[PDB]
């Protein structure tokens, strides 16, 4: 009956992420097909690489974004999938950091005063700036940047011991201006991994 | 007098740590346990550990990289949580491989799986797969993965099924330990800054 618009929000692995073949990758539609049942209702699916408070969809559900100041002002997080850390990575004075915009990831940096940010539009972009020297430093979540970089990269990653190590929610993520409906839905998408 | 403890790292668990290819280990856990080193004025020795034997088990240690399991419940006490895992089935491009004395192991008892495969560790468990002599693996999400993709060439394929367990990764002391490891307050997760 109903019909609710998910947007899938660069990458996350393991829910959603393209492995090294291209090939798209994840259990999030096992989670969401087990979602959309218990509420009776079908579901579309959009994926997006970045984030642009112009371009929100205030009836969507967004997955895959990070607290930011500057996001709070237009998204209600809820519920918890599940949590990351953050680390520095490099390859294996001055320097810059490689981050992605409007995450919690850059609000970190910027609030450590770190004035030599590079803003990357998704995990790939972040990557690749790093293989071309172009940053000499990238911050994000632990695993996906790991994976990613692997895939292009033909240099070992190597973690920053320094006080860079914070523990992140991921969590599911709501227009303020979303209608009735949606605020009352359920999504706790977590519940689906009984333990 | 400043106390000394010892921290055994059992297996391995990204990012916390992990083999990189130096033969060496990487992570972040070094620097959570210097800090709670400082804040319960003490010192502390870091070991690795590739298997849990019985007969070696120190209760003077505290162990790391363990998860609830039936048969290590009557020697562990299992105390904070360090992070969680997802329980995820992974197969390349049947008996199924998992790590034994882990609650993946339990899991696959409890669903009445036939052909089990008992491996040591990550990295013997990965090889049964690599070298085709299981067909499926079971265990964590994140290392089992990063050991095949980063030492094996093998980036492993997610089983769409209904498998996926939520994982409590918990921070492990023996039932015999000494009086003063006992009184140690063990919340290593909490020397994670949270966001605000
Ligand atoms: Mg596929």
Redesign the pocket.
């Known amino acids: 009956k109903d019909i609710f618009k998910f947007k899938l929000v660069d990458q996350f692995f393991p829910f959603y992420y393209k ?1 090294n073949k291209g ?3 994840g259990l999030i539609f096992s989670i969401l097909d087990k979602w959309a049942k218990d509420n009776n209702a079908d579901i579309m699916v959009e994926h997006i690489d970045n984030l642009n408070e112009s371009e929100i969809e205030d009836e969507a559900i967004y997955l895959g974004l990070t607290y930011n100041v500057k996001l709070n002002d237009f998204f209600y997080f809820k519920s918890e999938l599940a949590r990351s850390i953050s680390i520095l990575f490099f390859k294996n004075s001055n320097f810059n950091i490689g981050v992605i915009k409007n995450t919690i990831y850059e609000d970190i940096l910027r609030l450590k005063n770190v004035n030599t940010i590079f803003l990357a539009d998704n995990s790939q972009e972040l990557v690749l700036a790093l293989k071309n020297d172009k940053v000499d430093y990238i911050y994000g979540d632990c695993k996906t940047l790991h994976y990613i970089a692997n895939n292009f990269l033909s240099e070992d990653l190597v973690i920053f011991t320094g006080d860079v190590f914070y523990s992140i929610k991921n969590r599911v993520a709501i227009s303020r201006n979303a209608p009735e409906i949606v605020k009352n839905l359920n999504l706790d998408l977590f519940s689906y991994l009984m333990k």
Do not use: I
Request: charged share 50%.
């Open positions: 492995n090939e798209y990758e």
